[PDB]
């Protein structure tokens, strides 16, 4: 029994998920960060193929599955497709664990989810940014692990999302939340939280990553 992991965000635009995943991958370079926005719609290998490819080796334990998955259908598509394809990549005794990274607290209404997301991204254009990122926010369906598809998650990490905070201060706190929760729950992945100076350095280097 080797155990493999897929980290699945539940998020919308402006939740900082790529910053968070980039920071974690900087801290743990053996993890693989697969970005949906970098895969062609006509690519032969899609994100679920690439995810399982990046779990084939004994060196390969974690995939950061970088996609919003705002609607329940998208989480169901992950579970269905990975289950259908895993035999092409893993033997079927391998324990594959899905970890939800929940960027949006389930208490949040449709309305300050909008007000938080709207204000984080503006702090020139706004025609594009108001009722067209409200196509994004309308399709959000909170995680609900009491029924399908979200009941297939093995674990849920609950992140912070505050009206109050700067969007970059919140992303750094979320990185820390994920690490500490993994320390408690999956010591095979992280035995102890890295030094804070290391986490800060890896976060600052992620804030420069779009080269």
UniProtKB/Swiss-Prot annotation:
It comes from the Eukaryota. Has three domains each corresponding to an enzymatic activity, namely in N- to C-terminal order: ligase, kinase and cyclic phosphodiesterase (CPDase). Belongs to the TRL1 family. One of the two proteins required for the splicing of precursor tRNA molecules containing introns. The ligation activity requires three enzymatic activities: phosphorylation of the 5' terminus of the 3' half-tRNA in the presence of ATP, opening of the 2'3'-cyclic phosphodiester bond of the 5' half-tRNA leaving a 2'-phosphomonoester and ligation of the two tRNA halves in an ATP-dependent reaction. This is tRNA ligase. The gene is LIG1. The chain holds residues 409 to 630 of 832 of the full protein.
